[PDB]
Amino acid sequence: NRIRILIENGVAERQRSLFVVVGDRGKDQVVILHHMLSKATVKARPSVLWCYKKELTNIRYCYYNETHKILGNTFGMCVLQDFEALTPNLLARTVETVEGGGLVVILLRTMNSLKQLYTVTMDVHSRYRTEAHQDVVGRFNERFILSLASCKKCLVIDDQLNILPISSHVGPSDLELRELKESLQDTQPVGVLVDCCKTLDQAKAVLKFIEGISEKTLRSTVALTAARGRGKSAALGLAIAGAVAFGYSNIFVTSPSPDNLHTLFEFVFKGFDALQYQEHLDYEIIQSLNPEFNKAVIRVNVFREHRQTIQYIHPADAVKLGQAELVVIDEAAAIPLPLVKSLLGPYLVFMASTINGYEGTGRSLSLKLIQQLRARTLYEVSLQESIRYAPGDAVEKWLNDLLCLDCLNITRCPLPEACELYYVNRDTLFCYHKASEVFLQRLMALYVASHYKNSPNDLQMLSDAPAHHLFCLLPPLPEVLAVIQVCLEGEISRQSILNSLSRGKKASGDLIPWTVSEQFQDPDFGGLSGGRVVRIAVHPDYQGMGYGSRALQLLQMYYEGRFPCLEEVITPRKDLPPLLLKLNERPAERLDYLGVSYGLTPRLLKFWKRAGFVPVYLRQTPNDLTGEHSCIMLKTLTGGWLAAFWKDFRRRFLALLSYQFSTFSPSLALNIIQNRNMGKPAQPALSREELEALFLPYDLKRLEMYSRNMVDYHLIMDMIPAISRIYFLNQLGDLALSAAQSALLLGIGLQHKSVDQLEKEIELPSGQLMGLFNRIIRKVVKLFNEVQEK
């Protein structure tokens, strides 16, 4: 009979409920629950939502693949079917769209026992199938089932409304908000926009934004932080509408894609309606009418007293922000820092960010760490109350704990040489239990506090992957200094790889083996044993102390071989080995090489190269967002094939520096070009045979003539790309060229950069640049004369 009490409690406290129904029918329980919810609620039709994977009272039928379109909607309850289709990211997107007093219902199957641990038939499990490791053990399902007995609103029933023993163990906010609205009722476009707010926290950033807009000063960059469902686009839209009514003419909205917000402009129209604006003769909107989002509004024109416009602009587009009066930045945390700095200027800035949910990051965010330096204004506001349910919802806490979307960590010197590396048993890490879930939360806390976004699908990757291993660094459960996730790759095939080099298939894993072999046409690379470092992360409080390098070094020797191995519910688990195992008690796989795929970064490039990695691949097309190119590095473990791959990559990079790598800084390109792990077997010089074939005798005369009556460099600009090409190929001896001279030669020759363009990058005067360039010419001319036997 406890079903009724749970329904009444949820509807009387604005708290969602969670029901898990086990049964083949799945039709005699949804209607009963729907009737109970209708009786318990004031309304009649809660507009329930039903979702499927690919196939099967205002009910709309949605599909799992097409989910981003439903992010902005609100329903009374959620129904989930076809359990072997969900993903951790998907589970956090459908439950967040349920109003207070929800009736979220999940129908797994018609089991009669614990047939969920080994019944993993997820679509995502087909992409973990590696030919080397075809055995996959479901582990996420075990944690999901065991998490239903830790919350007070997670009742589990069957198709016959029978309570299982597992689940058998189990207003005030709207007080100051209405008072504030009444106080600001008489206020001219100040309180009317506040009336459109739904939460007291929402009508505090809006008031702050309105107060900043009211003061006609262009020095304010107040930033707002959200928590994925507490209201951030609505506050921004009301602020933009208030700015329009305040006489602002230049208002810009910054977002990576038009599809991101989809709500900011909706509330702008709502705010305009609160201002008694008719959007047919006082203002007009312009839609994309192009393959950008679906029907996102790009430009809005308002003509009441003067002409004002609201235009969507790209985060990288800052040229059109000259006469801008107000700029709105959405998800500035995920926006690259250099883009943020360029966007900011002497005008009003409205910043929005998320530090919770399945987005954003924390760990002393650099957003409010460097901007807190000044005439500039640094107001800050935040939200902590949801707009769809009462704070402290059991379902939200259950989702956050299961999905590890919490525990910002931060709360915590030892010498790096005294640290020890310990292997983590994934079998005992995802079995809930006690003192192990906290370790999992701490590990995931380090996971998400290192990089923006960090989609929760990695949690399933962390548990259900067949060839993934976890290593942690511990001081001499103690605090985890660093965590490393390594994926085993290689030992695939030779005949299938040969067919895969043709118009074949790239399987579903082994990114490094399927990329290096494809790019270098070497079928023998896939037969080697390798390990890919998928994720590495040190604690934010001890970055730069050497813990990451020591952890990488310890992993290298462990893989080399320097650590010889000398009804009727049930309890979660009692067996399984301890959580942490010493490196001396676990045999190694005897890997032949170590690889890593990451996004190119001058600081990351230095760290990886110092570890002993050699670049092997660099993607030409920039990756979407963050403006970075994918880079693949390899390191031999003990050479033959690495040297050949390194030489081939260096030759390709020289010619590819003119297509898409021209935007690279000369220092970054020079660092990629030169490595200390690989030697230079190019001792033989250019010789007179190649010098005459490559350069005409008149061309050599012009180069020699330039070195004695030094004149404008445009006469010999046709020879610079050839000279740079044959110098970086180690065919021009040594020439004792300095770092500045080498960078200048690379930029002018390979990148075809002008001297004025290189002025900012090199940060040297034009006279010094002329002298360095002229000195290179004399050195090349002198060496050429020596080659030609005087």
Tell whether residue 537 is among the known ligand binding residues: yes
For 93, residues 6+ apart whose C-beta sits below 8 A from its C-beta are 67, 70, 71, 358
Between CA 564 and CA 481 the distance in angstroms is 25
**Closer of 416 and 721 to ligand COA (Cβ):** 416
Q: Output the smallest distance, CB 547 to ligand COA, in A.
A: 5
Q: Output the smallest distance, CB 387 to ligand COA, in A.
A: 32
Q: Output the smallest distance, CB 522 to ligand COA, in A.
A: 24
What's the distance, Cα to Cα, between the start and end of the chain in Å?
104
Instruction: Rule CB under 8 A: say whether 697 interacts with its own copies.
Output: no
Structure tokens at 537: 């992360």
Q: Does residue 705 come out as left (phi exceeding 0), alpha (psi in the -120 to 50 range) or beta?
A: alpha
Between CA 577 and CA 427 the distance in angstroms is 9
Of ligand COA, its own copies, none, which one does residue 391 interact with (CB within 5 to 8 Å by kind)? none
Contact criterion met (CB below 8 Å) for 761 and 665: yes
Q: How far is CA 472 from CA 244, 402, 536, 582, in A?
A: 53, 22, 10, 11
Instruction: Rule CB under 6 A: say whether 549 interacts with ligand COA.
Output: yes
Between CA 455 and CA 448 the distance in angstroms is 9
Instruction: Rule CB under 8 A: say whether 648 interacts with its own copies.
Output: yes
Of 161, 545, 588, 685, which lies in the binding site for ligand COA, with binding defined by CB under 6 A?
545
Of 4, 69, 412, 451, which lies in the binding site for ligand COA, with binding defined by CB under 6 A?
451
For 340, residues 6+ apart whose C-beta sits below 8 A from its C-beta are 315, 329, 332, 367
Of 216, 314, 606, 610, which lies in the binding site for its own copies, with binding defined by CB under 8 A?
216
Q: Output the smallest distance, CB 714 to its own copies, in A.
A: 5
Tell whether residue 493 is among the known ligand binding residues: no
Q: Output the smallest distance, CB 450 to ligand COA, in A.
A: 4
**Closer of 140 and 645 to its own copies (Cβ):** 645
- Residue range at the interface with ligand COA (CB under 6 A); choices 26-34, 396-404, 432-440, 544-552: 544-552
Size, binding site for ligand COA by CB under 6 A: 19
Of its own copies, ligand COA, none, which one does residue 656 interact with (CB within 5 to 8 Å by kind)? its own copies
CB neighbours of residue 737 within 10 Å: 18
**Closer of 157 and 533 to ligand COA (Cβ):** 533
Instruction: Rule CB under 6 A: say whether 603 interacts with ligand COA.
Output: yes
Q: Output the smallest distance, CB 715 to ligand COA, in A.
A: 25
**Closer of 309 and 626 to its own copies (Cβ):** 309
**Closer of 201 and 489 to ligand COA (Cβ):** 489
Instruction: Rule CB under 8 A: say whether 651 interacts with its own copies.
Output: yes
Tell whether residue 536 is among the known ligand binding residues: yes
Of its own copies, ligand COA, none, which one does residue 366 interact with (CB within 5 to 8 Å by kind)? none
Q: Output the smallest distance, CB 306 to its own copies, in A.
A: 5
| Rounded (5°) CA angle 405-410-412 | 125
Instruction: Rule CB under 6 A: say whether 254 interacts with ligand COA.
Output: no
- Residue range at the interface with its own copies (CB under 8 A); choices 96-104, 224-232, 565-573, 698-706: 698-706
Backbone dihedral angles phi then psi of residue 350, each to the nearest 5 degrees:
-115, 115
Tell whether residue 662 is among the known ligand binding residues: no
Of 488, 536, 594, 720, which lies in the binding site for ligand COA, with binding defined by CB under 6 A?
536
CB neighbours of residue 534 within 10 Å: 19
**Closer of 220 and 361 to ligand COA (Cβ):** 361
- Residue range at the interface with its own copies (CB under 8 A); choices 41-49, 266-274, 570-578, 711-719: 711-719
Between CA 512 and CA 490 the distance in angstroms is 8
Residues 16-55 touching ligand COA, rule: CB under 6 A, are none
Of all residues in this chain, which one has the CB nearest to ligand COA in the complex? 548
The site map against ligand COA for 409-448 (x = CB under 6 A) is ----------------------------------------
Backbone dihedral angles phi then psi of residue 297, each to the nearest 5 degrees:
-85, 125
Of 68, 606, 651, 782, which lies in the binding site for ligand COA, with binding defined by CB under 6 A?
606
Tell whether residue 548 is among the known ligand binding residues: yes
Q: After which residues is the chain broken (C to N over 2.5 A)?
A: 56, 170, 374, 412, 476, 566, 638
Q: How far is CA 671 from CA 595, 660, 742, in A?
A: 19, 17, 11
Instruction: Rule CB under 6 A: say whether 487 interacts with ligand COA.
Output: no
SS3 track for 17-56: EEEEEECCCCCCCHHHHHHHHHHHCCCCCCCCEEEECCCC
Of its own copies, ligand COA, none, which one does residue 451 interact with (CB within 5 to 8 Å by kind)? ligand COA
- Residue range at the interface with ligand COA (CB under 6 A); choices 184-192, 261-269, 597-605, 676-684: 597-605
Of its own copies, ligand COA, none, which one does residue 111 interact with (CB within 5 to 8 Å by kind)? none
- Residue range at the interface with ligand COA (CB under 6 A); choices 61-69, 98-106, 218-226, 531-539: 531-539
Token look-up 């609103």 returns: 153
Of its own copies, ligand COA, none, which one does residue 621 interact with (CB within 5 to 8 Å by kind)? its own copies
Q: Output the smallest distance, CB 338 to ligand COA, in A.
A: 15
Between CA 703 and CA 696 the distance in angstroms is 11
Residues 466-505 touching its own copies, rule: CB under 8 A, are 501-504
Structure tokens at 57: 């009272």
Give 3-state DSSP helix, strand, coil % of the chain, rounded to 5: 40, 15, 45
Pairing, β 468-474 against β 420-424:
antiparallel
Within 13 Å of residue 709, how many CA atoms lie on the same side as its CB? Answer: 4
Contact criterion met (CB below 8 Å) for 231 and 270: no
| Burial class of residue 617, CB neighbours in 10 A (0-12, 13-18, 19+) | buried
Instruction: Rule CB under 6 A: say whether 535 interacts with ligand COA.
Output: yes
Q: Output the smallest distance, CB 607 to ligand COA, in A.
A: 4
* Radius of gyration from C-alpha coordinates of the chain: 31
CB neighbours of residue 655 within 10 Å: 11
Between CA 313 and CA 522 the distance in angstroms is 45
Q: Output the smallest distance, CB 147 to its own copies, in A.
A: 44
Between CA 536 and CA 483 the distance in angstroms is 6
Q: How far is CA 17 from CA 13, 211, 390, 624, in A?
A: 11, 40, 12, 38
Of its own copies, ligand COA, none, which one does residue 606 interact with (CB within 5 to 8 Å by kind)? ligand COA
Residues 300-319 touching its own copies, rule: CB under 8 A, are 303, 305-309, 311, 319
- The DSSP bridge partners found for residue 452 are none
Of 63, 269, 423, 520, which lies in the binding site for its own copies, with binding defined by CB under 8 A?
520
Of 129, 198, 219, 702, which lies in the binding site for its own copies, with binding defined by CB under 8 A?
702
For 758, residues 6+ apart whose C-beta sits below 8 A from its C-beta are 666, 744, 747, 748, 769
Tell whether residue 231 is among the known ligand binding residues: yes
CA 549 to chain centre: 23
Of 171, 322, 578, 767, which lies in the binding site for its own copies, with binding defined by CB under 8 A?
322
Binding-site sequence positions for ATP:
229-238, 388
Binding site for its own copies (CB under 8 A): 216, 247-250, 303, 305-309, 311, 319-320, 322-323, 325, 501-504, 518-521, 620-621, 648, 651-652, 654-656, 658-660, 662, 690, 693, 696, 698, 701-702, 705, 708-709, 711, 714-715, 717-719, 721-722, 752, 754
Binding site for ligand COA (CB under 6 A): 450-451, 535-538, 543-549, 596, 598, 603-604, 606-607
